[PDB]
Design a protein around this ligand. Structure first.
Ligand SMILES: CC#CCn1c(N2CCC[C@@H](N)C2)nc2c1c(=O)n(Cc1nc(C)c3ccccc3n1)c(=O)n2C
Ligand SMILES: CC#CCn1c(N2CCC[C@@H](N)C2)nc2c1c(=O)n(Cc1nc(C)c3ccccc3n1)c(=O)n2C
Ligand SMILES: CC(=O)N[C@@H]1[C@@H](O)[C@H](O)[C@@H](CO)O[C@@H]1O
Ligand SMILES: CC(=O)N[C@@H]1[C@@H](O)[C@H](O)[C@@H](CO)O[C@@H]1O
Ligand SMILES: CC(=O)N[C@@H]1[C@@H](O)[C@H](O)[C@@H](CO)O[C@@H]1O
Ligand SMILES: CC(=O)N[C@@H]1[C@@H](O)[C@H](O)[C@@H](CO)O[C@@H]1O
Ligand SMILES: CC(=O)N[C@@H]1[C@@H](O)[C@H](O)[C@@H](CO)O[C@@H]1O
Ligand SMILES: CC(=O)N[C@@H]1[C@@H](O)[C@H](O)[C@@H](CO)O[C@H]1O
Ligand SMILES: CC(=O)N[C@@H]1[C@@H](O)[C@H](O)[C@@H](CO)O[C@H]1O
Ligand SMILES: CC(=O)N[C@@H]1[C@@H](O)[C@H](O)[C@@H](CO)O[C@H]1O
Lengths: 728, 728
């Protein structure tokens, strides 16, 4: 008498997973948004006060997109007129509000089309980027000072990132870094002057007679890369009519000898900045420590003080070198590094000393350092029960490394196995977030004795609702390949009778350091295909996948479209042997990297698959960007790796496609994985006479996330899979 | 016969239609190529000697694309390195082979990347366009003379046409007109400085890292149009010292008050040129007869002797004011004109007297004037048996307008009802071309007494092959809606059964002055569909169609997307009725304007069609070019016809597509009907939640004519129709 999780349920969000997003405002309080009524919470006791009622601003004029309360609590930034650009960048209008005197500042307003704004870490200063130039406000109503004058669209970028850096380096549009004092303002400067431009047509509304051409500086594999510079401005010494003075911090000599990237920026203390540069050949990286010398007023980055981090098996770090976590005094820090056994662990570094010291060890990996105090270091790893797809919060007694405590392992063994944490400043408190295998559960904790303070959100409203639906179950196990464990998850149709034959959809990503087999709970497309269409949706992490050691993650070094492709097929094969999967009805599909892999598999000729769907997939590595691509493929030169670049295109496998049913999808406005890529694929198929299904999405980009487009693609895809499996 | 007409037959061109292309070189001889040999034939006796052997350019080095023998047969232009551009335009290299010797004039060679070349009507003079500038060579081995210096890519076009003129006006890349004498050289100049550019991505070869953006000056409905000037130069007076002086011939003052175009250029005599201008509001045109003043070296067009063409019911001409045929002395001429009752007949004009004299009348139309001797005017009409879809050659005795003879009606009644003709210069002979309903037949005739000299090609071979195959038959009938008769055709399956029920596909064009129903014989996709899949393929010429009077053709005036659409739906209702049509399986498909009509049809919610295929369809008239669009819709402004531009989009009907299975196809490199038009359609469907099938073709243009692309699309469409009609 129960219904099934239908496509519409997923498409129309019938079952809402609740969340609990707070922002620590101090060591003991946090802000939380409830019914548009911003509240302030006391962590210790749980009581609160409304900080700003929805009521306020009902006569503002425009819709408010986001809020940002200054560290002071005296002002609050009002963001509206939000126009999205890339994955993290966007532009918007801003207004400030004096809380001391319920008023909107009308004088010296932040300009329109501002690219980025940030309060200082303490107080109420402001720094913004308008027209690629950095401006600073000491007071909200006072006129701002101009820090840089070189800014110029699509060429010079100050305080903000260009395309690659936003996407592949900082996962952010910002390139501004305030000191903990608020005294200094460090910023990067990008220069795309010689960076080729990818161009594509944006059609826009019907009303538009002539389509428009978007031109973005985008460096494809091997092209000229943007260059970078770094500066630091003293915010307290800014006069009315006196251009501000930025002191540039050069990169190490080992980086300047060639192309290089700025990878990280971290303030150690009030007068010490940490910088990490990486070579274009992401083999070698160097952390730089620069101190402020009150004398000249310059910044020295002592050469002896440097720290090298290279790799012989592959690239450095998971996607970039790891971030350092300094001890309060700043003379030491902690950083996650690949050890001699190839596993990632916490290393302790002391500034004026050479080599570091590992604090953790084992056949598992530390995902990330979350908090640091004088007595403990808090991190998350997948040690518990040897599950790489599990996540847990641990404690390390700094005076005895052998004393490690798991803080989330036994809170809810049956329900919780994947955790992410959020510590208050100075780590007196911490919020745990469990996202599976059961419904998400948010809890507040005391740090002094690890006491559970209270449940913040347990999704019981969703639980009630779901007890009426026939939900699919998840199996997390592994298979063996040349004496190695490789995990896979299976989303099984409710009432899974392993004495029957079920069709199987292989959901793939399989990109460098990926992980599709894990313990998190999801309400997605696969949930539907399993609940209603009774299809088994499996995902496999083979060579290349991450969080299992460098031997597995680097197996694909300098050879994408190789072992990870083969392993997807081998997993699929062994799934067949299993007495519950119709080996005549096995499909595969993937988005982006998952789409390239899906194409590679369909064009392998294994005969293992009946059909496959590839969404906005890479087809030839020369078409993707320099940073991501080169990190694994090196350069596309004859001296370097040109042969394998040319040996791993989807096009070269066109002929084998005649053995399968292929559906190709792509948004015409994809700025990330250019339409060009799918364009070249279809042409390869047309040139060898192979028939296939196609579908473009006018003006959608990599995410094809516009409500209408989103429901459309998943509807289309469902039909394709239903027909490919002869399912009603 | 057992064997049927397969798709592979159509795509691989298994049963070829022989032909007989000849080029008349004089009053009684013509060239023809056998294999790779150019033979010259004598029309009177039929004897032929070899003019040039396939063994003359083996050691040439380049693959010869075409040849061009000069008037006095002394030289032969060799065309190679042919690189296509738009529909009629292209670039190529050339070499002149002197026949009076055994050499390739290697001195003053015609520059590479030449855009257009042409001999004079007499002798061996040579004019050519290069870099948008005109050059003239009196002798093939001599240094050419530059005629214009204003040439500027995409801006100033001298001697060649811009995109709109090439496609919608002169249907050719050339804008050069030699005078009979060979003395003068009139040319046109286009100024595209203020024309907007349509831009689209061209991905090219797999090796091209960044896609290339193509920009073509192209005016859409209501956009700024290219301007034009006319010139005439005396090529007898050309000194390599001083520059060649061009004389300009302004347009009629009644043309300069607003935008206008040049429509036709025809020389009457040695010193007389005929220029027809058209107002940007295509229902008013003025022909200009200009005479060369030998004393002032000028050209004067007495404003007194201008002729006016006007349309109250629509626009002028079928697609433009028809072409004049001057009597040898230049004092008069015949021109096809819509008479009082609205049918197009031959009119006789005497240069300095008002009005013209209709020398034909009837409820049928003159399709074209082909020749004009001192005693007879030859032309082709569809008078015979009141069949608009039939064509025949007629002769009118100039000294007694009532005496008209039919030169092809009775040649072979049951096999030939659609002729086209080619007269030898002076017209002593004429080659008649029979296109159907039977296999093509080519014959040579003498006009002295219209004696049939001989058969040139009768397709005996193709004929004997088809008897062995089970071919479909064609029915050319008509239905009556109100009180008017509208014709249609039907390609019926082999062994047709009036008691059996076959599915039906509606092949559609339906544009203004189109004719899909006729007596022509064709071997196409429709043949495959009826022969092998037993699908009835019917076409229908409803309102708007041509060759039947302005009552039917102008019905559509300023109202595209209405009657022509209704009439197609209607036709299908009637065919449904006919007891041999399964009203459960009726499909519709069209390309270009047919793509458009097919979409409107599918979006009307009529409930008649189950599925349909649209290829490179127009979606909204504001996206197509000005000259063709404005010709039927006027300007898209509020004071003009903007209301109907906005009420005739494929988009506004989106919702209705939920009731039909739709397949949308388009070449991404389409310069004619910009990919944009389909991109907006898909977005509308997606925005409204309608699932359809899609398919783009990277780098293909309006014709999707590359060998591989062409095969891929007709296969793709075949699977679609086969699956839409539950066909085994
Ligand atoms: C090309 C390429 C690529 C590589 N890639 C990256 N990075 C590392 C960080 C920076 C980025 N530049 C490159 N992140 C990824 C992927 C990826 O393929 N998929 C599969 C996937 N799966 C699904 C279901 C997706 C759905 C929508 C959009 C993308 C999707 N992608 C991912 O999920 N994530 C999170
Ligand atoms: C947009 C538009 C348009 C209108 N149009 C024109 N003209 C008039 C003269 C000037 C020109 N600019 C516009 N000629 C046409 C069409 C047309 O739609 N189809 C259907 C069709 N059908 C098939 C099967 C086709 C196949 C390939 C290419 C085109 C095709 N077209 C035609 O066959 N012909 C010959
Ligand atoms: C967020 C909040 O309301 N905190 C209040 C605090 O201001 C007050 O001093 C205390 C005693 O009543 O109760 C809570 O802790
Ligand atoms: C600081 C500033 O630029 N203010 C103007 C505002 O006065 C105007 O109403 C708006 C138009 O949307 O453009 C800006 O926001
Ligand atoms: C602000 C800045 O440093 N601009 C430089 C520019 O002067 C130089 O000519 C160019 C050459 O690549 O590189 C950068 O764009
Ligand atoms: C050769 C020629 O006619 N050039 C004209 C130029 O004189 C004029 O200023 C412009 C205005 O659109 O159009 C063209 O560029
Ligand atoms: C012989 C002579 O005067 N030649 C000139 C040429 O140099 C100049 O570039 C052109 C444009 O004004 O006009 C003439 O063709
Ligand atoms: C528009 C809006 O947010 N309204 C909410 C209302 O639903 C809620 O019941 C109330 C309780 O404080 O708070 C208001 O802000
Ligand atoms: C085209 C051709 O070859 N015509 C020749 C002609 O030159 C010659 O005068 C005649 C008499 O022998 O024989 C014909 O065959
Ligand atoms: C008349 C002339 O310029 N001919 C040259 C030809 O010799 C050369 O082979 C070709 C490209 O290699 O370019 C042509 O323009």
């Amino acid at each position: 008498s129960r219904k099934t999780y239908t496509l519409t349920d997923y498409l129309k969000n019938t079952y809402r997973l609740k969340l609990y997003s707070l922002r620590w405002i101090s060591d003991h309080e946090y802000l939380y948004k409830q019914e548009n009524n911003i509240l302030v919470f006391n962590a210790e006791y749980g009581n609160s006060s409304v900080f700003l009622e929805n009521s306020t601003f009902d006569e503002f004029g425009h819709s408010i997109n986001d809020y940002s309360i200054s560290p002071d609590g005296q002002f609050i930034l009002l963001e509206y007129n939000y126009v999205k650009q890339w994955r993290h960048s966007y532009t918007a209008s801003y207004d400030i509000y004096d809380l001391n005197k319920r008023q909107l500042i009308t004088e010296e307003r932040i300009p329109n089309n501002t690219q980025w704004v940030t309060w200082s870490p303490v107080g109420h200063k402001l720094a913004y980027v308008w027209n690629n130039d950095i401006y600073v406000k000491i007071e909200p109503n006072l006129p701002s000072y101009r820090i840089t004058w070189t800014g110029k669209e699509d060429i010079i970028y100050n305080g903000i990132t260009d395309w690659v850096y936003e996407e592949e380096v900082f996962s952010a549009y910002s390139a501004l870094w305030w000191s903990p004092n608020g005294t200094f303002l460090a910023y990067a400067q990008f220069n795309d002057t010689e960076v080729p431009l990818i161009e594509y047509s944006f059609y826009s509304d019907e009303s538009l007679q002539y389509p428009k051409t978007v031109r973005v500086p985008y460096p494809k594999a091997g092209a000229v890369n943007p260059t970078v510079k770094f500066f630091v401005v003293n915010t307290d010494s800014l006069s009315s009519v006196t251009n501000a003075t930025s002191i540039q911090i050069t990169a190490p000599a080992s980086m300047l000898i060639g192309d290089h990237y700025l990878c990280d920026v971290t303030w150690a203390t009030q007068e010490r900045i940490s910088l990490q540069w990486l070579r274009r050949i992401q083999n070698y990286s160097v952390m730089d420590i620069c101190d402020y010398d009150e004398s000249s007023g310059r910044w020295n980055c002592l050469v002896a003080r440097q720290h090298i981090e290279m790799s012989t098996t592959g690239w450095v770090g998971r996607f970039r070198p790891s971030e350092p976590h300094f001890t309060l005094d700043g003379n030491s820090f902690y950083k996650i590094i690949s050890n001699e056994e190839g596993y990632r662990h916490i290393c302790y570094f002391q500034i004026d000393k050479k080599d570091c010291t590992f604090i953790t060890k084992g056949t598992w990996e530390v995902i990330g350092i979350e908090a640091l105090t004088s007595d403990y270091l808090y991190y998350i790893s997948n040690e518990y029960k040897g599950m790489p797809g599990g996540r847990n919060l641990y404690k390390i007694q700094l005076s005895d490394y052998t004393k490690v405590t798991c803080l989330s392992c036994e809170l809810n063994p049956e329900r919780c196995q994947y955790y992410s944490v959020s510590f208050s400043k100075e780590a007196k408190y911490y919020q745990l977030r469990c996202s599976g295998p059961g419904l998400p559960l948010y809890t507040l904790h005391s740090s002094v004795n690890d006491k559970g303070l209270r449940v913040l959100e347990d999704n019981s409203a969703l639980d009630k609702m779901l007890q009426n639906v026939q939900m699919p179950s998840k199996k997390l196990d592994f298979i063996i390949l040349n004496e190695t464990k490789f995990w896979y998850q299976m989303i099984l149709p409710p009432h899974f009778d392993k004495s029957k034959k079920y069709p199987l959809l292989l959901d793939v990503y399989a990109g460098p350091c990926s992980q599709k087999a894990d313990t998190v709970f999801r309400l997605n497309w696969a949930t539907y295909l399993a609940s209603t269409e009774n299809i088994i949706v499996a995902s496999f992490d083979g060579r290349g996948s991450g969080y299992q050691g460098d031997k597995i993650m680097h197996a694909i070094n300098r050879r994408l479209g190789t072992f990870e492709v083969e392993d997807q097929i081998e997993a699929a094969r062994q799934f067949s042997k299993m007495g519950f999967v119709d080996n005549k009805r096995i499909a595969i599909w993937g988005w982006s990297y998952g789409g390239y892999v899906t194409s590679m598999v369909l064009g392998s000729g294994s005969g293992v698959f009946k059909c496959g769907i590839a969404v906005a997939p890479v087809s030839r590595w020369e078409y993707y960007d320099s940073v991501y691509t080169e990190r694994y493929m090196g350069l596309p030169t004859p001296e370097d790796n040109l042969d394998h670049y040319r040996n791993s295109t989807v096009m070269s496998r066109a002929e084998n496609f005649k053995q399968v049913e292929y559906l190709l999808i792509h948004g015409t406005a994809d700025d990330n994985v250019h339409f060009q890529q799918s364009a070249q694929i279809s042409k390869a198929l047309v040139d060898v006479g192979v028939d296939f299904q196609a579908m473009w999405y006018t003006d959608e980009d990599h995410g094809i996330a516009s409500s209408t487009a989103h429901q459309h693609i998943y509807t289309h895809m469902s039909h394709f899979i239903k027909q490919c499996f002869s399912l009603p």
